[PDB]
């Protein structure tokens, strides 16, 4: 991030939160991953891929 600290993990939910892509169609798939956490809580990498 802008602070200089590095985040290391394979979690798909955490990576998508840090990207924050400005493309409008890209924000749609990001929002679907957030709804995946409330209903289930995992599989965000599978749904996006």
């Amino acid at each position: 991030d802008g602070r200089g600290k590095a985040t290391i993990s394979n979690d798909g939910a955490t990576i998508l939160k840090l990207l924050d892509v400005v493309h409008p169609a890209a924000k749609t798939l990001v929002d679907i991953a957030k709804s995946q956490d409330a209903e289930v809580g995992d599989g965000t990498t599978s749904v996006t891929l």
Binding site: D1, G2, A6, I8, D20, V21, V22
Partner: protein, 520 residues
């Protein structure tokens, strides 16, 4: 946000770029490995200049922006709690594993599959170290062989002149604070100080806490045999604030009035010392000329202007407590010690306070004398790894002969175990063998000899001449077989060099991308 100007590195070129950034650190420290390793010039941000070959000190002073290069620095904090000597050897070994991994990426082998090969070959090398290891102090605790081992470690530093005397001090210091049977030695209980002047042969072992402060008055008693210690945050006198008193005296009427009130406070607190039975009074501030005048008549020595962190170190070592005010004084809060003396240095006015227990204790402090501050600073690091060598021998007395004999003997077993793995990880086991050969190879290169002719010559000796491992002489001694040269490193250190180097290579290979935004 801030997607534009965001530095991104991905793909197969990302791994080759991370290895290149890691080899830049390994190629820098490989010249300083060994006792003959060349030094490094350090220019501080404030303009200071220091010269040291210590690997742990270099990594702390290196400022690297690259992320993978920062991971190599964080490894030093983990190893210094164990070895503190061959820390450079781990960075060199980590750079050799990544350098040989570059040849495997061209063949199309997946990075995770390469990391599995190193982990599989690491356990074979660690297992081989247990067979060839020999003991020393097994079943019998003796200080005679323990002192000779520490004499070799100090030979690589600038203290190599006085190296023989400083070995007996580190032995008696660790055995005092903890028992070898306990196998628990804390570094927080051991302190190291020093001051310019004198020589390194004047190093002494004082059991207790020592800080440099003078007495409240020079005529105070210099020797207190009984143990009474009053540690307070306030001096003995009418109460004064922490900054400025600023007494208001309008005329002589207020002078004679307040002086009588002060005179009552003069004899009250000084005679209060004998009420609690205390002898030595440790106060954070100093005393007036009248306060020291009453101490000379009652024979009550004291220390003035004690520092903030010094108060906590004295109460812990002497077994006392911090007393905020004289109203809470009691017999339980008094500190103990065997002797209290004031030892000056030459003509210097320092006169460091000396607190001696006259017996064993749980904390000791080693003091070093020398003609240069940089030499004393390097003498402090000279004892740092020396304590780790003694501590490792207390935990496990099994040792493996160093000087490159350990790394070469392991690659012979790993290369044979490679043909027993019908799988793509076989290549990683072969590359792991050539990587272990780099550490003993850098020793001969720093000695001004042909690296390759020295390496292959030792291989033939261990296979043919004798089964025990033979080392390489970097000091230009008589011959090989460092067992006669008494160059020996602990077995715990050998297991950590392979384990920590495997962790770093495994983490670097599994990271395929580095992201970070730029200035917008």
């Amino acid at each position: 946000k801030d997607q534009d100007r965001k530095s991104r590195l991905m793909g197969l070129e990302a791994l080759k770029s991370h290895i290149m950034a890691a080899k830049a650190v390994a190629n820098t420290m490989r010249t300083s490995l060994g006792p003959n390793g060349l030094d490094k010039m350090m220019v501080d941000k404030d303009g200071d200049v220091t010269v040291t070959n210590d690997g742990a000190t270099i990594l702390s002073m290196m400022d690297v922006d690259h992320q993978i290069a920062k991971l190599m620095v964080e490894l030093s904090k983990s190893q210094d709690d164990e070895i503190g000597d061959g820390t450079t050897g781990v960075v060199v070994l980590a750079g050799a594993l990544l350098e040989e991994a570059e040849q495997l990426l061209d063949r199309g082998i997946h990075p995770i599959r390469i990391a599995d090969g190193y982990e599989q070959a690491a356990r074979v090398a660690i297992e081989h170290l247990d067979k060839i290891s020999d003991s020393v102090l097994v079943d019998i605790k003796d200080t005679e062989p323990l002192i000779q081992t520490a004499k070799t470690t100090l030979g690589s530093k600038v203290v190599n002149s006085c190296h023989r005397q400083m070995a007996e001090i580190a032995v008696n210091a660790v055995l005092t604070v903890a028992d070898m049977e306990r196998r628990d030695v804390d570094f927080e209980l051991i302190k190291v100080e020093g001051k310019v002047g004198g020589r390194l042969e004047d190093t002494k072992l004082i059991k207790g806490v020592i800080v440099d402060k003078d007495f409240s008055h020079p005529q105070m008693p210099k020797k207190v045999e009984d143990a009474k210690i009053a540690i307070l945050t306030c001096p003995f006198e009418p109460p004064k604030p922490k900054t400025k008193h600023k007494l208001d005296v309008t005329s002589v009427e207020d002078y004679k009035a307040l002086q009588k009130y002060e005179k009552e406070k003069f004899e009250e607190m000084i005679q209060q010392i004998k009420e609690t039975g205390a002898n030595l009074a440790i106060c954070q501030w100093g005393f007036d000329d009248e306060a020291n005048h009453l101490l000379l008549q009652n024979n009550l020595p004291a220390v003035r202007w004690v520092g903030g962190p010094e108060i906590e170190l004295i109460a812990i070592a002497t077994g006392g407590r911090i007393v905020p005010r004289f109203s809470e004084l009691t017999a339980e809060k008094l500190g103990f010690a065997g002797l209290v003396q004031e030892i000056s240095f030459g003509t210097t006015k320092d006169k460091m306070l000396v607190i001696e227990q006259c017996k064993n204790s749980r904390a000791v402090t080693i003091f070093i004398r020398g003609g240069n501050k940089m030499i004393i600073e390097e003498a402090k690091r000279s004892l740092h790894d020396a304590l780790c060598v003694i501590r490792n021998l207390i935990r496990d007395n099994r040792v493996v002969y160093g000087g490159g004999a350990a790394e070469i003997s392991c690659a012979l077993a790993v290369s044979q175990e490679a043909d027993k793995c019908p799988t793509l990880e076989q290549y990683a086991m072969r590359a792991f063998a050539d990587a272990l050969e780099v550490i003993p190879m850098a020793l001969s290169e720093n000695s001004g000899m042909n690296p390759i002719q020295t390496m292959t010559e030792v291989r033939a000796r261990q296979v043919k001449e004798m089964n025990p491992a033979l080392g390489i002489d970097c000091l230009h001694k008589g011959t090989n077989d460092m067992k006669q040269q008494h160059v020996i490193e602990t077995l715990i250190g050998k297991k950590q060099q392979i384990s920590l180097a495997t962790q770093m290579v495994r983490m670097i290979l599994k990271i395929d991308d580095i992201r970070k935004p730029g200035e917008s």
